[PDB]
Design a protein around this ligand. Structure first.
Ligand SMILES: [Mg+2]
Ligand SMILES: [Mg+2]
Lengths: 222, 171, 51, 159, 58, 185
RNA sequence: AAAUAUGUAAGAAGUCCUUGUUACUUAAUUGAACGUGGACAUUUGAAUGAAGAGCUUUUAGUGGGCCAUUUUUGGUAAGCA
RNA sequence: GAAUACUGCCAGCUGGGACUGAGGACUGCGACGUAAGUCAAGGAUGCUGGCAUAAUGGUUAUAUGCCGCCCGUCUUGAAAC
């Protein structure tokens, strides 16, 4: 019973088919991302050419970052922040956009900054600060074996599969999002850009919905 | 901030009783898209019975200046709230573009009447196509034939904390 | 024992994602788009330039 | 001194209403309650017997006992830091069936009908309710709907 | 030497420390307060049902 | 700062590694913590948790309870397991030929069991006979039969046994207990 | 006649079919309540989160409070009540 | 018919600076290689100089920069005139 060569070679081969499946899946995801965004651009161009207006779909995903600290919070926004898992300043979470979640975001408007994340900032968040919740422990991802062990029941095999499930809000978004530990970001590297934070972003402050400017803030804080 | 001009076109949400609402359009000076859409919904809530939950925005487009290197005279009609009431004013500004003209307008109102961005309403801004329709002396002063003037008392800021000669303010 | 970070450290980047090698090979980060000659309508441009 | 009687602060609560005073109609006597029905409590000031207390006005409970002219209802009352169980004997003029329960039962029977008809094909029934999703892409046209430009209106007195 | 008369300050915090736990509901709730003419017949009905089931699965 | 949703640093509240200083009990919990770690049978974890228990959480199990448990059908040849002590009962007259594994046996219970043809077995012999609890039956004594739980939760309209030293007439049978003297509870 | 607060429901202890008990009830196997047997399972019946869930015993200290935003009472007012 | 600005992306390249080197046979995931093997791939190694002593360091006194109200108690509140 040598047991160090045959099983090792079988394990290496099995990893080779796993790597091939991950490679072709990522090729398909890249193709569908670029065709989707180019189709949106061409649809806007054709609407302009025909003289109509192209109203694009409302975004189905937000990223929410807690901005205010933990002292002096009223109980209803405090409970909503605990239910959205924002128990620390500079902590972020993806939220699927629904009326039921928009009412929570309206409740905790003065203590968060949220917006519509892009593929680049989602990829940078999961790649740099990527932590899974494995039997109530915070485990860094760092290898696809962890992700296919814990989310492989729901089809997710790799980190880019998890990224795809986040960005295209699929059938198992809830499972993927609860598998993801809340993101612990730092303070922004270039500052907040405003002299005073706790006004609305429309008022020249920081809280509220900076609907597409959240990518700059999150990339500075990440 | 440094202002940009947008057109914002929106409408009410379509119902079965009335599809195709009337697609209202407005021109907003704002820092970005979020502030532009917020000001759009603010003025439509002042005008018609609609709000953001009951309506939608079909288009937002930046309108940059057609001739950004032509020197124009603009007449601007403005509402502002003072500490005791609401007043209408007409000010005219000689400047090269609409966004810069309304930037100097906001600075002028904040300087001379202590009126804030939340208090100023921009009724309209329009280029005055003909001279002698200019009605203010402070801009009619710069429309004379062969305008030239000197700049007395030049002050040159120094980089060193010590200067080795008495400076001159000749220009 | 130590979290090595992708987006630097191309070894662990290739460990997580095999597609990154052919992404860098084909240069899909800088991909040239196909040009279309569509022109907007006159009603669109006059609505844009309307005062 | 202070006054906390049984019907204190019940003035507008136990007024009848505008222009529907007088005797009560016979549907409240013809309605049938069974044990386990879920009922709303709203007192009728015209009937002084079997009246609920002012706490239970607008409360919803479960029938546990049926007698000759009254109904026993179970309410959960918050006392301090827990809920206690309260049993009330109320005449049937002060109760009516809760409509949310019958709406939910209609959803149950229509849901079972959908599952039963779609079990013959296996077409991913998707029986859970979903909330208001964000509205998707659309193309709005300007044929007969050219945009109208609006401006803020100047100030006037209007008196 | 007057003093504070009454307040409800801190009371909801004290309540929500250990929560407002909902009471535990059970299958077969208590039959006290139910009508005695109903219970007197219900006893005989269950006795006959138990005898019939015992004779069926004896 | 963290907005804590729970109490930090709290113990689990479940007793491990029992408070007794009995060296043979420590040997037994060593054997059964090995078995619970590696035999992946739920029986070993159950008896390992039962080995930690205090005296009032280990009530005695009578031979009448053992015989009543053996009269369940399909359970005549099972091995009875009592993590605790086994006392006898003179209220029963016939006893089957069982095997009973327990911590302690009283003299009467051991005499009854070996007189009926059965056998008394310790927990380590139980472990070497059935490492994964094959064909066993765990019995537990009645916890709520103690004298102390009579007075637990005493209050009005509870019927819950006042803490009293002397009983009889004129020892708490008066005002507050009959309506002829004031009220009734 | 609002806004904010507030009760209940969103299933398996459920739904449907068939027929057993009774001293209750009905003109009447009519109904009431509890049942036998059978069918419906992971989108099992909205969202989000769960950090374990539930239960018991015993005992300490405390039972002078005060301040801020908002609502508000007496007072001309108060760092007043 | 172009350019440029603005915004955004690159699993594009590359220069300078600071702090950290935890762990201690091997095991894992990978990469470059046909292969042997190699590697920046589950945490620092290689080369060199000076000194080998009060030189670094410890202790203690002093000086300097910034900070620091008297303890215990009652109290809503104590450095309390
Ligand atoms: Mg504040
Ligand atoms: Mg600041």
């Amino acid at each position: 019973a040598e047991q160090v060569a045959a099983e090792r070679a079988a394990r290496k081969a099995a990893n080779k088919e796993k790597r091939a499946i991950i490679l072709e899946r990522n090729a398909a995801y890249q193709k569908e991302y670029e065709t989707a965004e180019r189709n949106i651009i061409q649809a806007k161009r054709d609407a302009k050419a025909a003289g109509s207006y192209y109203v694009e779909a409302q975004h189905k995903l937000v990223f929410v970052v807690r901005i205010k600290g933990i002292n002096k919070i009223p109980p209803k926004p405090r409970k909503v922040l605990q239910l959205l898992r924002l128990t620390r300043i500079n902590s972020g979470t993806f939220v699927k956009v629904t009326k039921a979640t928009l009412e929570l975001l309206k409740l905790i408007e003065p203590y968060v900054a949220y917006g519509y994340p892009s593929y680049s900032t989602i990829r940078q968040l999961v790649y740099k600060r990527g932590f899974g919740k494995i039997n109530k422990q915070r485990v860094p991802l760092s290898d696809n074996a962890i992700i296919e062990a814990n989310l492989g029941k729901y089809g997710i095999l790799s980190i880019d599969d998890l990224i795809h499930e986040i960005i295209t809000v699929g059938p198992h978004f809830k499972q993927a999002n609860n598998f993801l530990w809340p993101f612990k970001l730092s303070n922004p590297s270039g500052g907040w850009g405003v002299p005073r934070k706790f006004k609305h972003f429309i008022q020249g402050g920081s809280f509220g919905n900076r609907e597409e400017f959240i990518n700059k803030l999150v990339k500075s804080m990440n | 901030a440094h202002f940009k001009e947008y057109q914002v076109i929106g409408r009410r949400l379509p119902t079965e009783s009335v599809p195709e609402p009337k697609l209202f359009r407005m021109r907003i000076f704002a820092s970005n898209e979020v502030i532009a859409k917020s000001r759009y919904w603010y003025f439509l809530q002042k005008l018609h019975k609609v709000k953001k939950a009951s309506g939608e925005i079909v288009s937002i487009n930046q309108i940059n200046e057609a001739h950004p290197t032509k020197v124009k005279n603009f007449g601007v009609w403005v509402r502002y709230d003072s500490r005791s009431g609401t007043h209408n004013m007409y000010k005219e500004i000689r400047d090269v573009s609409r966004v810069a003209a309304v930037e100097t307008l906001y600075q002028d109102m904040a300087a001379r009447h202590r009126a804030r961005f939340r208090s100023i309403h921009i009724l309209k801004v329009a280029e005055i196509e003909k001279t002698a329709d200019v009605k203010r002396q402070y801009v009619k002063q710069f429309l004379t034939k062969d305008l030239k003037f000197p700049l007395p008392h030049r002050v040159q800021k120094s980089t060193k904390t010590f200067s080795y000669k008495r400076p001159s303010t000749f220009y | 024992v130590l979290k090595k970070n992708p987006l630097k450290n191309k070894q662990v980047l290739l460990r997580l994602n095999p597609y990154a090698k052919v992404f860098a090979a084909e240069k899909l980060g800088s991909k040239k788009a196909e040009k279309t000659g569509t022109k907007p309508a006159a009603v669109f441009t006059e609505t844009l330039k309307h005062d | 001194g202070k006054s906390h009687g049984y019907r204190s602060r019940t003035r507008y609560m136990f007024q009848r209403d505008f222009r529907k005073h007088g005797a009560v109609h016979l549907s409240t006597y013809l309605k049938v309650y069974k044990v386990g029905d879920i009922v709303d409590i709203k007192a009728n000031g015209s009937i002084q017997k079997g009246m609920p207390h002012k706490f239970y006005q607008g409360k919803t409970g479960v029938v546990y006992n049926v007698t000759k002219s009254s109904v026993g209802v179970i309410i959960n009352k918050m006392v301090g830091n827990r809920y206690l169980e309260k049993r009330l004997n109320l005449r049937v003029e002060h109760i009516k069936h809760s409509k949310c329960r019958q709406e939910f039962l209609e959803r149950v029977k229509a849901n079972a009908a959908k599952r039963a008809e779609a079990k013959a094909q296996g077409v991913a029934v998707q029986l859970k309710r979903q909330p208001a999703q964000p509205r998707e892409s659309r193309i709005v046209s300007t044929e007969g709907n050219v945009p109208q430009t609006l401006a803020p209106v100047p100030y006037e007195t209007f008196i | 030497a007057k003093s504070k008369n009454h307040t409800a300050h801190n009371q909801t915090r004290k309540a929500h420390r250990n929560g407002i736990k909902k009471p535990k509901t059970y299958k077969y709730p208590s039959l006290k307060g139910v009508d005695p003419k109903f219970r007197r017949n219900h006893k005989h009905a269950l006795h006959g049902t138990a005898k019939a089931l015992a004779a069926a699965k004896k | 700062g963290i907005d804590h949703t729970s109490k930090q640093h709290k113990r689990s509240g479940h007793r491990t590694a029992p408070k007794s200083d009995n060296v043979y009990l420590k040997l037994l919990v060593k054997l059964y913590t090995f078995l619970a770690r590696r035999t992946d049978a739920p029986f070993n974890k159950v008896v390992l948790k039962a080995l930690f228990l205090s005296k009032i959480n280990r009530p005695p199990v009578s031979v009448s309870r053992i015989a009543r448990a053996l009269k369940q059908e399909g359970a005549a040849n099972k091995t009875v397991v009592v993590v605790g002590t086994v006392t006898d009962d003179a209220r029963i007259f016939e006893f089957p030929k069982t095997t009973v594994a327990a911590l302690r046996f009283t003299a009467g219970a051991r005499a009854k069991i070996v007189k009926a043809g059965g056998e008394c077995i310790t927990l380590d012999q139980l472990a070497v006979r059935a490492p994964k609890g094959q064909n066993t039956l765990i019995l537990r004594g009645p916890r709520n039969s103690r004298e102390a739980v009579r007075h637990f939760g005493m209050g009005p309209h509870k019927g819950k046994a006042p803490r009293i030293l002397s009983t009889g007439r004129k020892f708490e049978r008066a005002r507050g207990r009959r309506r002829s003297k004031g009220f009734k509870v």
